[PDB]
Amino acid sequence: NYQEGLRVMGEVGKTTGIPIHVFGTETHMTAIVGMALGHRPIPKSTTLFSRHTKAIVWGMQTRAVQGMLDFDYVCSRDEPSVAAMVYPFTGDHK
Amino acid sequence: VSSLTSGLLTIGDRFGGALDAAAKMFSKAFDSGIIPMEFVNKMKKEGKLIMGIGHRVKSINNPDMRVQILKDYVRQHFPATPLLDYALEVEKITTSKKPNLILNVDGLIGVAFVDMLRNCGSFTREEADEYIDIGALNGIFVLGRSMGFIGHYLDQKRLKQGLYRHPWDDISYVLPE
Amino acid sequence: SAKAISEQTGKELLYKFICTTSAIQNRFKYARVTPDTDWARLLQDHPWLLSQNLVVKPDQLIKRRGKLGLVGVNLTLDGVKSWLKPRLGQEATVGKATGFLKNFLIEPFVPHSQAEEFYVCIYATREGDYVLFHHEGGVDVGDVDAKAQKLLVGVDEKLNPEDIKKHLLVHAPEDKKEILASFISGLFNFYEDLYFTYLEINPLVVTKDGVYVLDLAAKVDATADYICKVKWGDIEFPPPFGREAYPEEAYIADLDAKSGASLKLTLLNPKGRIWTMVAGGGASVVYSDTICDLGGVNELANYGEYSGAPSEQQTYDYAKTILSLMTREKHPDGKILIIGGSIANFTNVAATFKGIVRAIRDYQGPLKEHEVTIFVRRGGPNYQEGLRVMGEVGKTTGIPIHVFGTETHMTAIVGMALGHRPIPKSTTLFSRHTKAIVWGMQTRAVQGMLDFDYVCSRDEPSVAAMVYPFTGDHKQKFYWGHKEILIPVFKNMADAMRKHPEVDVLINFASLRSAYDSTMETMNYAQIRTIAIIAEGIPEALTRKLIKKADQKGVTIIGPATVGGIKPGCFKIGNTGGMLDNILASKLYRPGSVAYVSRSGGMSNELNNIISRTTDGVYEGVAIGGDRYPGSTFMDHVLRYQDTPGVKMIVVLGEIGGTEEYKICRGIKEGRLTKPIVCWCIGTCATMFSSEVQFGHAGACANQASETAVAKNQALKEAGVFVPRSFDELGEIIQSVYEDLVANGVIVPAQEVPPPTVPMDYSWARELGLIRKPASFMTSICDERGQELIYAGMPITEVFKEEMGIGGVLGLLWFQKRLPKYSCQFIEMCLMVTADHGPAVSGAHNTIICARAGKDLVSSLTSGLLTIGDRFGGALDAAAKMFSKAFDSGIIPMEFVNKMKKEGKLIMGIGHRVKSINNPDMRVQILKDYVRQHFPATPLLDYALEVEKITTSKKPNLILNVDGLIGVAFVDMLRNCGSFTREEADEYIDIGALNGIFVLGRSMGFIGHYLDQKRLKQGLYRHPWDDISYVLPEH
């Protein structure tokens, strides 16, 4: 949600009168430097993974596993990349 | 036992009460001698809804299977069903208002049970009327549902379900200042 | 509405209820004859048929019978039979109507002179009822409207008999004036009390003997059935002569009558290839019109509609009727189904379309066989979801379905289907300060209003309180943007009014039955100046009384049978405009310069769409409702608009019938209406000149030609009104007007300001699959959500059909398995032996103590159940666990016995107080024997019985007891019945399924005790002090 974060920055500039120039991912990271200085104008195995790779996640990392599974879905993978999880404090469960 | 009782303790008024309530309401109306239409209007005037009438989806054209199963057994085997007859006549009136104002399973069981006590020939009227009053009908629901609740208890244990905490998003906090 | 009744039905009610000093002769002397008449039965019921000479005439809503020679006068019963021989069952042509003569009426012949024939008629109008009387009655009465003595009985007025004598009976013979006055007076009360809208007696015969009702022609207010059912009885409304009724028409009529929704169906040409299933009474007409205009008049099969938010089931029942009707015979060019509608306000489109989709799935075979192509166009609440389901059923069945939304012009799918075009009194009523009371429990309507208010940038919500008579006073939660607010709900209107003096508008969601009284009550609170009556179906007569009171009290009525109206930026009546998305789509959050008035609520929502796309928007819009006499008429609102400075142009959506639209022509002529007016009157059809043949002499004259939509449209265009070519040009002409007005500086459009933002509803976002939220709960035993209840995959009907029993049901809910019959029977057996064991046990004791302490069943039962677990009731589980462990560990019975001794443990399920190896326990005997007989294998029981051999050899009472027997037997049943894996059987034991058996079983005994104590009327228990050893600390 960087788009809205850049909005609060632009807004504080307007309300205070301080000149604030706000840029996103579309701008090269270091482009603001040249702009600020006034040089440019302000506008073993070879293969490790396959589409068949199945992994075990050691730890209770729900967000990470879900993240992986959303990437897999969007990649049009046939099966999820996480096969099981290992968490030593709880008994076996799903 | 703790899990079952925790659930059973909700049975009584707004949940599980309807069988006893319907039986009592319809018995009163029938025994008072008022005709079904008089009853429907009396309730409207008193600002009361009929206990054992209404369904969310099921209507006159789309029947409740539980009610169908029971209604059919009762007609086929019970010698006499005067209260059920009375209730079904009330249903004819209410469904003519809104189609989903059917006689529901709580109402059906309630009036069927009263007909069973009164007309099976094992009880005097006094006996039949005392059993209804002391809450025999509540016993039916409690004993019946106890199976479902034990079912759920076993299910949750088998499903290895973790501790529940209600989400704060579903709670409206309206505290003093 | 007002429906015609037979002469028999009329005479019956008349004879039965007319109260008069006048002796009415030949009461109940009338007999009905059909081709199925049993003359012997007829004579048994009517012996008077032989007493005197008779008159025979048909009772089929055939007017001017006598002039057609269809009245056989002064005949014997033999003569009547002879007269009917060539007529009964014969086809007859009365004007342009051809049908069969099926129904006849026999009456006694009344000898009288022509001087002795009279004419009486009573008929309702908006202003009250008219009573007509003429002393020259008979078949030669002629234009009775001009000839006869008129008299108006005002609305809540009484017919004073001096006025009858004074004005009606002017040319009546002096000697017959008192009898006629007495009869007319009595007739008027009968007309009133039975809800007639028209009642005509020609001739009324008055002889030296008394009054005779020789002929009846009456229409009743069919909507008033809920009142009169008792008096009316099994009243049948005959279809007009020549028209032959269909069983499908009768079915839909029944559905409509039993619901708050409107479901109408009339077959035009059963063999036509064009079928319509349109939502809304307005749209139905417009679609019928468009088809007629594109030449399809001869291929149009029906005219019907569904509206007023019908259930999925009602929509299914309606749809199946249409689909059934169109798949009776094949057409060479196939058939068309037009599933249309305008943009809905409250009819949930997702919901209604699911009903239709279900009917299409059921009729997919015949629909493919009859080469049916479907065209859908609909807008409104959740239309997005309903349109998706339509497209999907077309793919899955193979039926060609073309689905369109609000972006498509309403009538565009007609040309698409026919293959002509390719398939791609107070002026101001509301302010921004207006506060209202909603009568009824309408949460969605209220929230809808509140969302409109927030986007209109109103400072306060438009709903102040709600009145719902069934609940006690409480507060209801609502949303003001994203902030939760509370709205008060009152049991009594008196309290609401008292606490909210700021309220001046009342929105009435009361049912047709409750509506009259609730409105009448509101009128007793002078603060209320505008009432919106939503209910469709209030008897005409009761509405006239609401108009009279509102008129004299200065209260403006919008309705009945209306959605309401909308004043963009200020106020919106309940559901007008529908969901926020439509309010935003048609830019109804900000005002324009165009004001409109419509009869149809649905067409009002289409007008918002049209006006928004062609002009600067709607200033104010009103749907006057569809009932015969509306609370506020077209002219009433047109004049308000003419007098509102902000209104720059007016749009009127007229209809066929009535002469209201002519008041506008008159207004323009008179110079009262100066603002440009755009008008279209819908109903340009009836090209099928049905020309509903005049009911009796009183109505028969007027000018039914001027009433027509074609006539009105011509008259208005000549008057100076801007009238389009057809409905499909209505957008163009409105745009044409607006462009001239901006060009002439009359309209100065304002710059567009973005409205405040409101978050999407979770329910809605989830429906469109935009968001995902993980479920907090997981279940697998029962599903109540379906058509049918499901217990572990098996539907409840199958449960009974397969004769599962309590045992069987327990198998599904507890183990989610269909167990063998022996297993079920065994479970039932366990439950029976564990049912009770006297009142001395820990649990029973507590339940009894509790019952005695005056508690309820559930408290008393629980109090006892809470002792079950360890030292009481534990044994079943304990024994099963112990023996399983020992068996499975591989130790031999003797090794087990000694292991336990060494560990200092007693065997669970071994031992009895009295029962020994010579004196057995019957419960154990019963169970052992069942198990031995029916269980395929019992290895654990075998092991346990071997342990028993060892323990009884020590002490004779160390027998395998019932808790041990059930324990081991149950383990053997789980492991060896073949429904469970070893893992499954072992988990069930561990999670305590066996505890469940004892708890469920003993629950019966405990309820037994509770009832017993209550029946025994046992008093409070207090334990005796003598049984208590007090060992307190020393002070």
Ligand SMILES: CC(C)(COP(=O)(O)OP(=O)(O)OC[C@H]1O[C@@H](n2cnc3c(N)ncnc32)[C@H](O)[C@@H]1OP(=O)(O)O)[C@@H](O)C(=O)NCCC(=O)NCCS
């Ligand atoms: C009028 C309307 C708002 C409400 O109708 P509804 O849902 O059928 O009415 P209710 O919610 O009040 O319920 C109907 C009856 O069932 C009764 N009822 C409900 N549950 C009951 C129960 N368990 N026991 C007994 N009676 C019960 C209510 O008391 C009510 O009685 P009443 O009609 O004598 O007041 C609705 O029908 C509607 O929207 N109609 C559309 C009309 C239309 O076309 N408008 C114009 C737009 S152009």
Ligand SMILES: Nc1ncnc2c1ncn2[C@@H]1O[C@H](COP(=O)(O)OP(=O)(O)O)[C@@H](O)[C@H]1O
């Ligand atoms: N019962 C009767 N006794 C005597 N004359 C009758 C009787 N019924 C009808 N008539 C005569 O027949 C005429 C036609 O019957 P009527 O009921 O008025 O039918 P319609 O007006 O439809 O032609 C009446 O005007 C009356 O003169």
Ligand SMILES: O=P([O-])(O)O
């Ligand atoms: O049924 P309608 O015409 O009021 O929409």
Ligand SMILES: [Mg+2]
């Ligand atoms: Mg006549």
Ligand SMILES: [Mg+2]
């Ligand atoms: Mg309607």
